[PDB]
């Protein structure tokens, strides 16, 4: 079975949080002008398209990018709908058959437009994390930019994710893709410093 | 079995090419300032550290990183050792076992210092290209920056090797992995007009 993308474009068009660097690639020196390559630059803030969060993000103590657990972020995973639910909590997660799953993606189909920053979104609430930790899961996805509101500035899921052991990635891309069981890849790049990593999300059908 | 990481870490203090843009994380707002996040600029060259070029790099008319096949970079991969060798080509890849092979990773264990820039690499020669494409190999990886010498602005290993399909991953980290098979992940970025893309590139033993 072939890997099916669901990371989000990256080019000068993509959306950003308000305020926050927009994207940037540009051919710097053509291959004209250096007679041999096209030398490029690439300038773009962390969370930016389908990317994961580091607890530093959130928590100037927390672990940056390459302390991050690389097991987490490879291996089977659950997509599930969501859509239609002003937030999501411990009591629209009971209804599904989670056990034995390690990562889980969300589909709210909420918003799905890479190129514009949307203006509400479908949050995480807190009891979530006790209940996806007690199950084992050690990641969670989301196909909006946030787990919080996006005018919160308390982070109480990001918070409360990372004080389970649950990773975060945001703008993934679920509407071309069927609920139930996947082989995930979701790689941060090495970033020693980092509150946070763009990566190339893909799935495979289990 | 656990995944392995072969990828250099990113950093301000990584090499660069001559010439290319420095490597730059910073964060852009501290969570003092936004009072609730650290969120991060990245700057670089694609270029930096482990990653994979597109054909756009060295051929106007090449693919850019989003039109790769990413079935590519995702699949078994077997690794040599091919030190203490000023190049390499066809000669010195007939010795081994290679049948069926798709995804080949050559440790030259040339250079290994990811934050100084070599004066000079081990190459591949011209005629790697249809001898590998001959037995179905469809990526190369190296340990070293460049599949070409660091001066030549021919360029005639890239060049030779995606006339024969095979794609190209530089400065993956090879000196704490032993020869053999193993499942690669090395994806690029979803980028949709980039000459090459940073991935983080890790193994998992068969
Ligand atoms: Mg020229
Ligand atoms: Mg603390
Ligand atoms: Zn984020
Ligand atoms: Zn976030
Ligand atoms: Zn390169
Ligand atoms: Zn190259």
């Given at each position: 079975?072939?890997?099916?993308?669901?990371?989000?474009?990256?080019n000068?068009?993509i959306?950003?949080?308000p305020?926050d660097?927009?994207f940037?690639?540009?051919?710097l020196?053509?291959?004209?002008?250096?007679?041999?390559?096209?030398?490029?630059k690439?300038?773009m803030?962390?969370?930016?398209?389908?990317?994961?969060?580091?607890p530093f993000?959130?928590?100037?103590?927390?672990?940056?990018?390459?302390?991050?657990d690389?097991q987490?972020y490879?291996?089977?995973?659950?997509?599930?709908?969501?859509?239609?639910l002003?937030?999501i909590?411990?009591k629209?997660?009971?209804?599904?058959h989670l056990?034995?799953?390690?990562?889980?993606?969300?589909?709210?189909?909420?918003?799905?437009?890479?190129?514009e920053?949307?203006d509400?979104?479908?949050?995480?609430?807190?009891?979530?994390?006790?209940?996806?930790?007690?199950?084992?899961?050690?990641?969670?996805?989301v196909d909006?930019?946030?787990?919080?509101?996006?005018?919160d500035?308390?982070l109480?899921?990001?918070?409360?994710?990372?004080?389970?052991?649950?990773?975060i990635?945001?703008?993934?891309?679920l509407?071309?893709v069927?609920?139930?069981?996947?082989?995930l890849?979701?790689?941060?790049?090495?970033?020693?410093?980092?509150?946070?990593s763009?990566?190339?999300?893909?799935?495979?059908?289990?």
């Amino acid at each position: 079975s072939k890997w099916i993308d669901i990371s989000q474009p990256l080019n000068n068009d993509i959306a950003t949080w308000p305020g926050d660097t927009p994207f940037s690639y540009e051919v710097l020196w053509s291959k004209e002008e250096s007679g041999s390559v096209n030398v490029g630059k690439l300038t773009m803030s962390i969370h930016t398209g389908t990317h994961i969060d580091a607890p530093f993000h959130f928590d100037n103590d927390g672990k940056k990018v390459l302390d991050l657990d690389i097991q987490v972020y490879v291996g089977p995973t659950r997509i599930i709908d969501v859509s239609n639910l002003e937030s999501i909590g411990k009591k629209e997660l009971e209804k599904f058959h989670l056990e034995g799953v390690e990562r889980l993606l969300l589909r709210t189909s909420s918003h799905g437009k890479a190129n514009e920053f949307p203006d509400i979104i479908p949050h995480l609430r807190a009891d979530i994390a006790p209940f996806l930790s007690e199950k084992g899961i050690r990641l969670i996805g989301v196909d909006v930019p946030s787990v919080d509101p996006l005018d919160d500035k308390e982070l109480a899921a990001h918070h409360q994710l990372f004080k389970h052991s649950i990773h975060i990635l945001e703008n993934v891309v679920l509407d071309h893709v069927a609920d139930g069981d996947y082989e995930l890849i979701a790689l941060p790049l090495a970033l020693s410093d980092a509150d946070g990593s763009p990566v190339r999300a893909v799935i495979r059908p289990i």
